[PDB]
């Protein structure tokens, strides 16, 4: 809504809400001392399209939303627990330096 | 290393494969065939310098035996027969994957355990093609006369009838375009003059028949009714001993794509259903549709009314093939419960990735032609999220589904601050995952009075990502042999004995460090081969 | 001098440490063979 940050401080709330398993999404936000001033389903859909792009949730049946099980990645496609050597090592692979 | 990183295409990959494990004299000839296309021996010697005419033929028979080139003959009316020689792109990929087939026999032949040919069945693949071609008499006449090789000879019909041991022919050692022409000219001489009507259809009358010849003549190696000998003595069934056979890349490549796609399951579900999906996957590998599609290689892919038919009937091939549409009943005996067989498979259709989605009720099957386009875009977007910021994963998905985004709707659709989106989008023009589309609102296309639009352009982003990895495979291959040039005087001493107690340090720390390279190459090769399902 | 590495940077696992042995003796067969 407002252009300055703390947008994502509420998007962690909706993602913890669904991980246990769109009109119902409104009334969970009204409680729990949420620092809010105006809610509407037009906004919350635009608030929901953010995590569609991060693949933290999924869009099914045109209004329903499931978790993509990135909670198990939250806790080869396994991009943490791959720590580099990076020190005194010459034969390492870089993504740049071919352009 | 700026001398390397600039003026080296995939020619830098194909030059140093033969340079690694073969002599230097053949790295100069196959470097010339790729750089020039095709040329016969009468003008090959003019291009290279330092190789005699019969020394080319001695050099050319080396990569002949390992199937690293492909020949052609076309005569002239006035002249003699000219032997045009081409380059083989699939014969040298065998030399690339060569460490991985040894571990592909093991992960696919799992009926046996604690066998005394584990050291031998790992060697038969090293025996079949490191010699070049292979025939049956070459291993039975070895240093051992009997050695219970009647078990070993009957072991190979278990290992040939499961695939990738097809008898070689002139089909595998000629390319695909120089076969299609003279049969299209044979089918044109099959139908003569004496019909004037619809001559454009008469020119295509050979073309409808040459399609039926094309899929026929490529099954002649695949057809298994003439590759083994029924013999009523001392055995039951055995391969014909007079057969010259090598390995085949396709069922390895189809098995690798199937190995590539089960890893998408372990992400979209846990490990119970990931264990379920392996069994129905592995059983359809011996007869799966073709990955490389020799239909679509070279021919009438130009016009859409023919280019539609390259997947119209091909999807009808996949839908109306009997030997893969499993009943969903016989899966319980293969797993070491027709409720849980259907229930753990019911979540496959419910997930929005179309594997085990479209079917007939009761008999379900995994489609291919509308699946692997979704695998390639899923693996590529995670590479961007892995090596650079997660903001780019948000932006690249945003411009994907939202067609032709501008810079105002990009802050309506996504939510980031304005200063941070420049520091993430400008990393995507440099690597071509986004593009620019311009509208000149003034005269003569002036830039300050103009606004800019974006696009995905879902082919240019995958070509650049392909060749961003074909170089990195070969650059790691460049530091393979160049590491073995220093510390070479004791690599000869390590090869003349089959002991200075301080010199041995300078042989292990160079050998443990090159142990990392083959593991780093295998992971990148898994990252590269996804972009070959064209 | 260049930044931004690929994420394939791991100390080698013995699941694929045997896989790297099959490469070095493959070329040792072919180079010390006929060619």
Swiss-Prot record, chain A:
Covered range of the whole protein: 169 to 316 of 317
Task of the protein: DNA-dependent RNA polymerase catalyzes the transcription of DNA into RNA using the four ribonucleoside triphosphates as substrates. Specific peripheric component of RNA polymerase III which synthesizes small RNAs, such as 5S rRNA and tRNAs. Involved in recruitment of Pol III to the preinitiation complex. Involved in the configuration of an initiation-competent form of RNA polymerase.
Localization terms from the record: Nucleus
Family as reported in the entry's similarity comment: Belongs to the eukaryotic RPC34/RPC39 RNA polymerase subunit family.
Organism for this UniProt entry: Saccharomyces cerevisiae (strain ATCC 204508 / S288c)
Subunit structure: Component of the RNA polymerase III (Pol III) complex consisting of 17 subunits. Interacts with BRF1/TDS4.
The name this protein goes by in its record: DNA-directed RNA polymerase III subunit RPC6
Curated annotation (Swiss-Prot), chain B:
Gene3D superfamilies named among the record's database cross-references: Winged helix-like DNA-binding domain superfamily/Winged helix DNA-binding domain
Protein name per Swiss-Prot or TrEMBL: DNA-directed RNA polymerase III subunit RPC3
Function: DNA-dependent RNA polymerase catalyzes the transcription of DNA into RNA using the four ribonucleoside triphosphates as substrates. Specific core component of RNA polymerase III which synthesizes small RNAs, such as 5S rRNA and tRNAs.
Coiled-coil ranges per UniProt: none
Family per record: Belongs to the eukaryotic RPC3/POLR3C RNA polymerase subunit family.
Gene that encodes the chain: RPC82
Leucine-zipper: region residues: 469-490
Cellular location(s): Cytoplasm; Nucleus
Major localisation: cytoplasm
Keywords assigned by UniProt, alphabetized: Cytoplasm, DNA-directed RNA polymerase, Nucleus, Phosphoprotein, Transcription, Zinc
GO cellular component, one term: RNA polymerase III complex
GO MF, one annotated term: single-stranded DNA binding
Keyword Transcription attached: yes
Stored PANTHER family: DNA-DIRECTED RNA POLYMERASE III SUBUNIT RPC3, RNA POLYMERASE III DNA DIRECTED -RELATED
GO terms for biological process, alphabetical: termination of RNA polymerase III transcription; transcription by RNA polymerase III; transcription initiation at RNA polymerase III promoter; tRNA transcription by RNA polymerase III
Source domain of life: Eukaryota
UniProt miscellaneous comment: Present with 2520 molecules/cell in log phase SD medium.
Subunit: Component of the RNA polymerase III (Pol III) complex consisting of 17 subunits.
From Swiss-Prot, chain C:
Ranges in coiled-coil conformation: none
Domain of life: Eukaryota
Cellular location(s): Nucleus
Note: The acidic domain is essential for its function.
Oligomer and partners: Component of the RNA polymerase III (Pol III) complex consisting of 17 subunits.
Family designation: Belongs to the eukaryotic RPC7 RNA polymerase subunit family.
Reported function: DNA-dependent RNA polymerase catalyzes the transcription of DNA into RNA using the four ribonucleoside triphosphates as substrates. Specific peripheric component of RNA polymerase III which synthesizes small RNAs, such as 5S rRNA and tRNAs. C31 is involved in the formation of the initiation complex.
Protein name (database record): DNA-directed RNA polymerase III subunit RPC7
Encoding gene, per UniProt annotation: RPC31
Whole-protein residues included: 36 to 70 of 251
């Amino acid at each position: 809504e407002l252009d300055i940050e703390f947008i994502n401080s509420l998007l962690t709330i909706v993602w913890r809400f669904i991980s246990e398993n769109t009109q119902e999404i409104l009334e969970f936000i009204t409680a729990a001392q949420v620092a809010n001033v105006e809610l509407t389903p037009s906004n919350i859909r635009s608030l929901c399209e953010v995590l569609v792009y991060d693949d933290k949730l999924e869009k099914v049946t045109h209004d329903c939303y499931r978790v993509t099980l990135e909670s198990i990645l939250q806790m080869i496609f396994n991009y943490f627990k791959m720590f580099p050597a990076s020190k005194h090592d010459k034969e390492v692979v870089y993504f740049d330096e071919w352009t | 290393s700026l001398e390397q990183r600039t003026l080296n295409p995939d020619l830098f990959l194909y030059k140093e494969l033969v340079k690694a494990h073969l002599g230097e004299r053949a790295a100069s000839v196959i470097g010339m065939l790729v750089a020039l296309g095709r040329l016969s021996v009468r003008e090959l010697v003019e291009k290279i310098d330092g190789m005699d005419v019969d020394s080319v033929k001695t050099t050319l028979v080396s990569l002949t035996q390992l199937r690293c080139v492909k020949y052609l003959q076309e005569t002239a009316i006035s002249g003699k027969k000219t032997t045009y020689y081409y380059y083989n792109e699939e014969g040298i990929h065998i030399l690339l994957y060569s460490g991985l087939i040894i571990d592909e026999i093991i992960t696919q032949m799992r009926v046996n355990d604690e066998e005394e040919h584990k050291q031998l069945v790992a060697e038969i693949v090293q025996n079949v093609i490191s010699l070049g071609s292979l025939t049956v008499e070459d291993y039975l006449s070895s240093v051992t006369s009997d050695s219970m090789k009647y078990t070993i000879s009957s072991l190979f019909v278990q290992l040939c009838e499961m695939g990738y041991l097809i008898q070689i022919s002139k089909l595998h050692y000629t390319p695909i375009e120089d076969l299609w022409q003279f049969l299209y000219e044979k089918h044109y001489k099959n139908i003569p003059r004496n019909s004037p009507l619809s001559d454009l259809k008469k020119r295509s009358q050979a073309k409808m028949n040459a399609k039926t010849d094309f899929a026929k003549i490529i099954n002649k190696p695949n057809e298994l009714s003439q590759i083994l000998t029924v013999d009523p003595k001392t055995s039951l069934r055995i391969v014909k001993p007079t057969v010259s056979l090598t390995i085949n890349l396709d069922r390895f490549m189809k098995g690798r794509r199937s190995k590539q796609l089960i890893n998408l399951a372990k992400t979209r579900v846990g490990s119970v259903t990931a264990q379920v999906y392996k069994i129905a996957l592995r059983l359809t590998e011996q007869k799966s549709p073709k990955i490389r599609d020799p239909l679509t290689q070279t021919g009438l892919l130009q016009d859409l009314e023919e280019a539609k038919s390259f997947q119209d009937e091909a999807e009808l091939v996949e839908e109306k093939t009997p030997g893969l549409t499993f009943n969903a009943i016989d899966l319980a005996r293969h797993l070491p419960s027709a409720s849980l067989i259907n229930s753990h498979l019911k979540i496959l259709a419910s997930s929005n990735f179309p594997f085990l989605n479209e079917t007939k009720p009761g008999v379900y099957y995994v489609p291919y032609s509308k699946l692997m386009p979704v695998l390639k875009s899923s693996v590529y977007e995670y590479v961007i999220a892995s090596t650079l910021g997660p903001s780019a994963m948000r932006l690249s998905r945003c411009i994907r589904d939202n067609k032709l985004v501008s810079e105002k709707i990009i802050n309506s659709t996504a939510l980031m601050k304005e200063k941070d989106i420049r520091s993430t989008l400008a990393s995507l023009i440099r690597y071509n995952s986004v593009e620019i589309q311009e509208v000149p609102r003034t005269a003569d296309r002036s830039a300050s009075r103009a606004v800019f639009l974006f696009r995905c352009k879902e082919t240019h982003s995958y070509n650049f990502m392909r060749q961003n990895l074909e170089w990195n495979m070969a650059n790691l291959l460049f530091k393979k042999e160049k590491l073995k040039q220093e510390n070479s005087t004791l690599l000869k001493k390590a090869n003349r004995d089959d002991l200075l107690p301080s010199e041995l340090n300078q042989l292990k720390m160079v050998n443990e460090r090159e142990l990392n390279v083959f593991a780093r190459l295998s992971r990148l090769l898994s990252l590269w081969e996804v972009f070959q399902m064209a | 001098f260049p930044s931004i590495p690929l994420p394939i940077n791991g100390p080698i696992t013995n699941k694929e440490r045997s896989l790297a042995v099959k490469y070095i003796n493959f070329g040792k067969t072919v180079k010390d063979g006929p060619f």
